[PDB]
Write an enzyme that holds these catalytic residues in place. Structure first.
Site, PDB file in Angstrom:
ATOM      1  N   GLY A  15       0.847  -1.174   0.000  1.00 22.66           N
ATOM      2  CA  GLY A  15       0.000   0.000   0.000  1.00 22.66           C
ATOM      3  C   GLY A  15       0.888   1.231   0.000  1.00 22.66           C
ATOM      4  O   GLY A  15       1.969   1.236   0.589  1.00 22.66           O
ATOM      5  N   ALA A  66       0.496   8.969   0.475  1.00 22.72           N
ATOM      6  CA  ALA A  66       0.313  10.062  -0.464  1.00 22.72           C
ATOM      7  C   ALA A  66       1.652  10.640  -0.909  1.00 22.72           C
ATOM      8  O   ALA A  66       1.814  11.017  -2.068  1.00 22.72           O
ATOM      9  CB  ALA A  66      -0.548  11.152   0.174  1.00 22.72           C
ATOM     10  N   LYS A 107       5.232   5.492  -1.191  1.00 24.01           N
ATOM     11  CA  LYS A 107       4.702   4.149  -1.011  1.00 24.01           C
ATOM     12  C   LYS A 107       5.272   3.511   0.258  1.00 24.01           C
ATOM     13  O   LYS A 107       6.174   4.054   0.892  1.00 24.01           O
ATOM     14  CB  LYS A 107       5.037   3.291  -2.227  1.00 24.01           C
ATOM     15  N   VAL A 108       4.737   2.354   0.625  1.00 22.23           N
ATOM     16  CA  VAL A 108       5.192   1.647   1.815  1.00 22.23           C
ATOM     17  C   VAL A 108       5.509   0.196   1.463  1.00 22.23           C
ATOM     18  O   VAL A 108       4.609  -0.639   1.365  1.00 22.23           O
ATOM     19  CB  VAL A 108       4.119   1.684   2.910  1.00 22.23           C
ATOM     20  CG1 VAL A 108       4.614   0.982   4.145  1.00 22.23           C
ATOM     21  CG2 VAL A 108       3.758   3.123   3.223  1.00 22.23           C
ATOM     22  N   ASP A 129      -5.958  10.625  11.414  1.00 26.81           N
ATOM     23  CA  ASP A 129      -6.135   9.826  10.192  1.00 26.81           C
ATOM     24  C   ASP A 129      -6.448   8.334  10.402  1.00 26.81           C
ATOM     25  O   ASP A 129      -5.824   7.482   9.772  1.00 26.81           O
ATOM     26  CB  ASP A 129      -4.894   9.972   9.292  1.00 26.81           C
ATOM     27  CG  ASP A 129      -5.151   9.544   7.850  1.00 26.81           C
ATOM     28  OD1 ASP A 129      -6.153  10.007   7.260  1.00 26.81           O
ATOM     29  OD2 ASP A 129      -4.344   8.758   7.290  1.00 26.81           O
TER      30      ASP A 129
HETATM   31  O1  LIG Z   1       3.153  -3.455   8.516  1.00 26.61           O
HETATM   32  C1  LIG Z   1       2.612  -2.413   8.009  1.00 26.61           C
HETATM   33  C2  LIG Z   1       3.138  -1.052   8.454  1.00 26.61           C
HETATM   34  O2  LIG Z   1       4.188  -1.000   9.400  1.00 26.61           O
HETATM   35  C3  LIG Z   1       2.586   0.165   7.934  1.00 26.61           C
HETATM   36  C4  LIG Z   1       2.866   1.579   8.204  1.00 26.61           C
HETATM   37  C5  LIG Z   1       3.724   1.991   9.259  1.00 26.61           C
HETATM   38  C6  LIG Z   1       3.967   3.358   9.502  1.00 26.61           C
HETATM   39  C7  LIG Z   1       3.356   4.344   8.688  1.00 26.61           C
HETATM   40  O3  LIG Z   1       3.624   5.628   8.966  1.00 26.61           O
HETATM   41  C8  LIG Z   1       2.514   4.001   7.613  1.00 26.61           C
HETATM   42  O4  LIG Z   1       1.963   5.077   6.889  1.00 26.61           O
HETATM   43  C9  LIG Z   1       2.253   2.648   7.352  1.00 26.61           C
HETATM   44  O5  LIG Z   1       1.525   0.061   6.986  1.00 26.61           O
HETATM   45  C10 LIG Z   1       0.956  -1.189   6.470  1.00 26.61           C
HETATM   46  C11 LIG Z   1      -0.087  -1.129   5.456  1.00 26.61           C
HETATM   47  C12 LIG Z   1      -0.616  -2.356   4.900  1.00 26.61           C
HETATM   48  O6  LIG Z   1      -1.569  -2.285   3.871  1.00 26.61           O
HETATM   49  C13 LIG Z   1      -0.143  -3.617   5.407  1.00 26.61           C
HETATM   50  C14 LIG Z   1       0.877  -3.685   6.408  1.00 26.61           C
HETATM   51  C15 LIG Z   1       1.514  -2.450   7.008  1.00 26.61           C
END
Ligand SMILES: O=c1c(O)c(-c2ccc(O)c(O)c2)oc2cc(O)ccc12
Lengths: 243, 289
Positions: B10, B13, B16-17, B132
């Protein structure tokens, strides 16, 4: 811009206990700018008068300046600063501080045009962050205002005006080096008392919450008064003729 | 330098992550949130800063329901800011799908709603607002534990502080937000409610297209407030709009739970139950807790 109002769950429970707690998490152990070998305390007082001027002029949220000072002092416990470098270091603390505690951040152009290149400021913001391991935030003297008013039973319809002045003087008081010793909890109290005083806001003689504040902050009463006197001092010593 | 990106989980904005491996621990999985710090002229991105600041400021408390921040990598080579978090098995939206019929068991939905309220109580007790909340920002571990994530908009809330005109995807934005008025901790309660009402039926409770349609979808359920619960502050009247049983939308919800989902989905924010009192509410009287 929509300013924030009262939130009973953010400022009515036991947020105070936590503020007092989070306060005692930046143990002192060291003197003000103890490590610096080329910049003095008087340099700080000057630098701080310019930062205060910057935050006030741009109408930034009351929490910016005291977070800026926090960053600055912390950073100057881990890195060295030079006489011709402070202005930039301080500029950078205001940049960071403002990014966090206020909605419309202080830009780099706004800080450059006022003095470095808009890339010297940036590498400075960076060098400060890595230095603090990005652990930027902190407990601000300014954070106690509402909690204390509530705990002190001061009536809410006063809060806005009471808060307005309290914050202002506390910010000017933080410029003074003698205040950097004190904890944010006391620095606030003294600031509230001082404001309450030089402006009767239908508040029983300022000399009434003198106890509650002590039972609350856990210090004596001689302590709270001493602090009220100090913040009032730092406040009057504020002088633009040092720039 | 030592993080081998395995795959995106996912994207936010401003970046990506990805989920990755690292030479630190065998094959360890750490969540990687890398932000593109383009050499515009503003320096480090405000979001990236607030977030790390907040998280880093409470860490000592090692709260169970808050995600953990591992590290912050930065290559000065634009510059690349890579924030490294812990990796949980999946977010809540992912769990709210791969769950066998008929959905999640009424008790499992109670234990997360609790854990979810435990993070907020903590957050708010320190004057922080996670502006959020949404399924995509909740991390669900295999063990069943709940973690709050993406503090990108999180900030220390203080009196008379100015506020931005926007946050919370939409289907989770609180009426007061959709109206352009002040706000605070209640915003997260509205989200938690929306997320609560969303755990039973595996699908968004208020999916809307715009501010008017969303505000209308929301009201279409709770019902038009009273001339005493509408901001006197600003915008659209209460006339701008012209009370269906909550169950009609939440496929079978316990009378006590249905009472909670409404305590969170209260229009007037000052009358909206707090995460604190919420952990005391009868809907939790008997969980393995
Ligand atoms: O294991 C996950 C994770 O650590 C984070 C995350 C951590 C810190 C953030 O600031 C952020 O925006 C996302 O998202 C995710 C989104 C998914 O669909 C699935 C797994 C995770």
């Amino acid at each position: 811009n929509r300013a924030k109002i009262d939130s009973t769950t953010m400022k009515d429970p036991r947020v105070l206990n936590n503020l007092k707690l989070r306060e005692l998490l930046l143990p002192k152990f060291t003197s003000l700018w103890e490590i610096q070998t080329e910049v003095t305390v008087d340099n700080r007082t000057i630098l701080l008068t310019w930062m205060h001027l910057l935050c006030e002029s741009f109408e930034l949220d009351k929490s910016v300046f005291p977070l800026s000072v926090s960053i600055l002092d912390r950073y100057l416990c881990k890195k060295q600063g030079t006489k011709k470098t402070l202005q930039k270091i301080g500029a950078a603390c205001v940049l960071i501080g403002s990014k966090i505690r206020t909605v419309k951040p202080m830009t780099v152009s706004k800080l450059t045009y006022l003095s470095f290149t808009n890339l010297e400021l940036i590498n400075q913001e960076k060098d400060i962050l890595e230095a603090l391991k990005w652990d930027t935030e902190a407990v601000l003297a300014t954070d106690f205002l509402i909690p204390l008013c509530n705990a002190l039973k001061i009536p809410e319809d006063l809060w806005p005006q009471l808060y307005e002045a309290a914050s202002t003087t506390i910010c000017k008081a933080l410029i003074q080096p003698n205040i950097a010793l004190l904890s944010p909890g006391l620095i606030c109290a003294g600031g509230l008392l001082t404001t309450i005083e030089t402006d009767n806001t239908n508040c029983r003689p300022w000399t009434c919450y003198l106890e509650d504040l002590s039972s609350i902050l856990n210090f004596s009463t001689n302590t709270v008064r001493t602090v009220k006197d100090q913040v009032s001092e730092a406040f009057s010593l504020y002088d633009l003729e040092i720039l | 330098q030592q993080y081998e990106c395995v795959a995106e989980i996912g994207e936010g904005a401003y970046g990506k992550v990805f989920k990755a491996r690292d030479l630190k621990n065998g094959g360890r999985f750490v969540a990687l949130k890398r932000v593109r710090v383009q050499t515009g002229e503003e320096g480090m991105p405000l979001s990236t800063i607030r977030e790390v600041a907040v998280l880093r400021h409470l860490e000592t408390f090692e709260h169970p329901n808050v995600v953990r921040l591992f590290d912050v990598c930065t290559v000065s080579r634009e510059t690349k800011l890579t924030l490294v978090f812990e990796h949980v098995d999946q977010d809540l939206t992912t769990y709210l799908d791969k769950v066998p019929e008929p959905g999640v068991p009424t008790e499992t939905i109670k234990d997360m709603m609790f854990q979810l309220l435990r993070g907020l109580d903590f957050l708010h007790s320190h004057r922080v607002v996670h502006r959020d909340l949404k399924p995509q920002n909740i991390l669900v571990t295999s063990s069943g534990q709940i973690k709050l994530a993406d503090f990108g908009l999180a900030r220390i809330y203080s009196f008379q502080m100015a506020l931005t005109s926007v946050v919370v995807t939409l289907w989770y934005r609180a009426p007061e937000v959709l109206l352009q008025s002040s706000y605070a901790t209640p915003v997260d309660l509205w989200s938690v409610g929306c997320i609560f009402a969303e755990m039973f039926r595996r699908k968004p409770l208020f999916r809307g297209s715009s501010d008017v349609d969303q505000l209308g979808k929301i009201l279409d359920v709770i019902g038009l407030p009273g001339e005493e619960d509408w901001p006197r502050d600003v915008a659209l009247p209460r006339q701008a709009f012209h009370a269906q049983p909550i169950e009609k939308f939440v496929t079978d919800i316990d009378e006590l739970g249905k009472d909670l989902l409404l305590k969170c989905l209260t229009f007037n924010p000052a009358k909206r139950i707090s995460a604190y009192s919420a952990l005391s509410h009868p809907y939790f009287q008997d969980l393995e807790r």
